[PDB]
Amino acid sequence: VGSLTINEERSEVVDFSVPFIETGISVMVSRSNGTVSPSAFLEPFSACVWVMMFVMLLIVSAVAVFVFEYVTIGKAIWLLWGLVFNNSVPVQNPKGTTSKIMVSVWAFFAVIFLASYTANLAAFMIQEEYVDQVSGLSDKKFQRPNDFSPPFRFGTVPNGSTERNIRNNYAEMHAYMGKFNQRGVDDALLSLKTGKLDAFIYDAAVLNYMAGRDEGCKLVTIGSGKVFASTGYGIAIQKDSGWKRQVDLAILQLFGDGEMEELEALWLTGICHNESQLDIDNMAGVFYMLGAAMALSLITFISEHLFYWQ
Amino acid sequence: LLWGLVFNNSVPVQNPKGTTSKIMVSVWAFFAVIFLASYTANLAAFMIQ
Amino acid sequence: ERVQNSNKKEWNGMMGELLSGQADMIVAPLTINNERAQYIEFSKPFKYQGLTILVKKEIPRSTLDSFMQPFQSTLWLLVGLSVHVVAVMLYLLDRFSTLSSAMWFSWGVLLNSGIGEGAPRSFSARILGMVWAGFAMIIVASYTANLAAFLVLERITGINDPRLRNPSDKFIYATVKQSSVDIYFRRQVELSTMYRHMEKHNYESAAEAIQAVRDNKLHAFIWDSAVLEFEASQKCDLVTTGELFFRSGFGIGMRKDSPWKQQVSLSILKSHENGFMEDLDKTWVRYQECDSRSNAPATLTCENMAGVFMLVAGGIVAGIFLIFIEIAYKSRA
Amino acid sequence: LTILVKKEIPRSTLDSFMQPFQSTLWLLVGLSVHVVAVMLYLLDRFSTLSSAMWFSWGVLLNSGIGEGAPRSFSARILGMVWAGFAMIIVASYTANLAAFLVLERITGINDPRLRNPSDKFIYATVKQSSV
């Protein structure tokens, strides 16, 4: 009795009791800084709003012609952009008091508009959650760490069940991890806090305890409880002894009474069980929306050689 | 002039003469954008708590 | 159960057919209990899961229907009357120290639209215009904050909820009859009254109660997490509510002392070793979703814009008629 | 009975006097201003010259400083998305200013800081008392 997992390499020699505590192979991740979304909130205003804007914007050219009949080719949209995006660009107003009405509607559309988009954006950027930049053991980061300025360093304790499980599925993984052995759980946490280790791989229950018993409650484990090789604990016993089937009854009776949740007060409870924009350099998407226009301004410059043929 | 840009308005106002007068208004506009975004910030913090 | 009003206890359903020799192995989601494992050998139990509660998610709306009307009761036209009377006041201040155009000034003060007018010559109107622009900034800032307030702004929790622990009529609870939940409840004495409230509403199959929760005839349902967490990921209108009670795993039910009892306890573990079950549940269990109900109201649904665009859709129609009336006035005088 | 603890400091964001992100509140955007002024100059040259930055800053800071619109439409279509970008960065600055201004101690005897003892916490009561 104690912390002792169940596997196949031990079941050949020893007989086992009923599985006892759910566990597996998990991974403790570093305590990284908080991150906002990698783009500005360009999510679906473009589906309805950004396309209705142009088609309700272009319709005023007829009335802009009609007020001069009783200044539209280039000046109309040049006026109609300056007030929708809240700017005092030097723009001549149109003639007459009859032209003054629709701009006074458009200004009220502008004040409704920008206060909407600031509203939705301010709702969006104080409710969005940090996303888990590494996920699963099948990632390229958890494969051979080739293309990474200084590459990933995986920690493990080199004597036990997890080494014998990882040596039978991924040989080159533990062949790389052999340089990164650890001598203890707290030495693994001290090596993770001092930048000496990037990630740690161990059992699920001990890691889920020490996630909840750190003095801070920064980032802990990949995902929420995703374990790789789900197994259990148990109680080892003499092989095919008669005392097996009794404990096999009695443990199930314990499962029948709920006394593990009464024994929870010593067991796995804790503090913080999932209860600054220096990263604002994610704006490169709108910088790509800048430089794409910096391409198109050259493209239109090239098609401004067409009066040479006309 | 100095009230129209601190409270974000395109009031019809003649600009001052010369490019040397153009500097301090361009500082005041940056004080305005810091200002109103501050007061809207503090007010928006205040009315949801 | 004790059947035939005598001293005979038979096993209903599937396990009686295991006991009667109708089969020799049970490969199904069959839980591990103390009462079934009295004389029926199991295996290493496939999985780890627990019991959880299933309820129906609500509507809650977005603020789309406030198309520029969040407070249109008190988004008053009184402020427009204030515009008109301060235009009259500036007119009188300019008169008795640019006359009919004062409202075309003042609206251009309001809407941050530089419409082509002249400043008032007297300073007494100018000092009013200063605090008028300050007031305009105040009301637009208050509108922004009150728009954010609409867009920034609790179900049952376990068996320790007084909606569920202390019974009532306003909540209906049910589980599948003759199942392990009915065993766990009749075994427990502290939940006995709950079971006595459970005896009048139970169902016979899982899909019956799953369809009956969505018809609001049954406010809650109790079953395993490894089915309800899949069902709340496919029929994407319902939700679970968290914690577990009776943590176990479905095991293979075998007849007692069959010679395969050492083989199948190995090969299950082998399938847990070489990554087979992760392919299996990736193929079968976690293959589909709609959306994880984390209750994030910070999202769009700016789908419709009808109530905010209809003001300009009526303006474009009425404007040509007002232009015709204005030019008929220009022709007349 | 109840537990007595010491309140903390926590600060306000006063020390961010127009520097919440002055690492990444870059001067790179001012270099972007300068190179798009050079680009509008070249677009106006080979189709109001030295004054283009006095235009463009007045586009940026919502300050109507007394200039002329570009004559070519190819500079005008750049100015459209430039003003849109200016609106984007000022809206992001407002929201990130609000984020600083919108954003846990022990709870009873059922706390593992107190139920399960340690060295990092010290507990005491008056001797010979009812506690």
UniProtKB/Swiss-Prot annotation, chain A:
| Topology feature Cytoplasmic, residues | 95-101
Q: Which residues are glycosylated?
A: N33, N159
Q: Which residues form a coiled coil?
A: none
| Disulfides per UniProt | C217-C272
Binding site residues for L-glutamate: T5, R10, S161, T162, D203
Extract one GO molecular function annotation from the record.
Answer: ligand-gated monoatomic ion channel activity involved in regulation of presynaptic membrane potential
Q: Where in the cell is it found?
A: Cell membrane; Postsynaptic cell membrane; Late endosome; Lysosome
Q: Where is this site: Functional determinant of NMDA receptors?
A: N86
Assembly description: Heterotetramer. Forms heterotetrameric channels composed of two GluN1/zeta subunits (GRIN1), and two identical GluN2/epsilon subunits (GRIN2A, GRIN2B, GRIN2C or GRIN2D) or GluN3 subunits (GRIN3A or GRIN3B) (in vitro). Can also form heterotetrameric channels that contain at least two GluN1 subunits and at least two different GluN2 subunits (or a combination of one GluN2 and one GluN3 subunits) (in vitro). In vivo, the subunit composition may depend on the expression levels of the different subunits. Found in a complex with GRIN1, GRIN3A and PPP2CB. Found in a complex with GRIN1 and GRIN3B.
Protein's name in the database: Glutamate receptor ionotropic, NMDA 2B
Species of origin reads: Rattus norvegicus
Output the lineage of the source organism: Eukaryota, Metazoa, Chordata, Craniata, Vertebrata
Designated gene of the protein:
Grin2b
UniProtKB/Swiss-Prot annotation, chain D:
Region span, Pore-forming = 49-70
Gene that this polypeptide is encoded by: Grin1
Domain characteristics, as noted in the entry: A hydrophobic region that gives rise to the prediction of a transmembrane span does not cross the membrane, but is part of a discontinuously helical region that dips into the membrane and is probably part of the pore and of the selectivity filter. The extracellular N-terminal domain (ATD) is a site of allosteric regulation to modulate overall receptor function.
User: What does UniProt note about where in the body, tissue by tissue, this protein is expressed?
Assistant: Detected throughout the brain, in brain cortex, cerebellum, thalamus and olfactory bulb.
The subunit field of the Swiss-Prot or TrEMBL record says: Heterotetramer; the NMDAR subunits are modular and harbor tiered domains that function in concert to regulate opening and closing of the cation-selective ion channel pore. Forms heterotetrameric channels composed of two GluN1/zeta subunits (GRIN1), and two identical GluN2/epsilon subunits (GRIN2A, GRIN2B, GRIN2C or GRIN2D) or GluN3 subunits (GRIN3A or GRIN3B) (in vitro). Can also form heterotetrameric channels that contain at least two GluN1 subunits and at least two different GluN2 subunits (or a combination of one GluN2 and one GluN3 subunits) (in vitro).
- What is its biological role? Component of N-methyl-D-aspartate (NMDA) receptors (NMDARs) that function as heterotetrameric, ligand-gated cation channels with high calcium permeability and voltage-dependent block by Mg(2+). NMDARs participate in synaptic plasticity for learning and memory formation by contributing to the long-term potentiation (LTP). Channel activation requires binding of the neurotransmitter L-glutamate to the GluN2 subunit, glycine or D-serine binding to the GluN1 subunit, plus membrane depolarization to eliminate channel inhibition by Mg(2+).
Per UniProt, where does glycine bind? S130
Protein name, please? Glutamate receptor ionotropic, NMDA 1
Positions bearing carbohydrate:
N116
Q: Which residues of the full protein are shown?
A: 538 to 689 of 938
As for PTM, the annotation reads: NMDA is probably regulated by C-terminal phosphorylation of an isoform of NR1 by PKC. Its phosphorylated state is influenced by the formation of the NMDAR-PPP2CB complex and the NMDAR channel activity.
Q: Which family does it belong to?
A: Belongs to the glutamate-gated ion channel (TC 1.A.10.1) family. NR1/GRIN1 subfamily.
Q: Where in the cell is it found?
A: Cell membrane; Postsynaptic cell membrane; Synaptic cell membrane; Postsynaptic density membrane
Please list every transmembrane segment annotated in the UniProt record, as residue ranges: 23-43, 77-93
Residues in the Cytoplasmic compartment per record: 71-76
Which ranges does the record annotate as intramembrane? 49-70
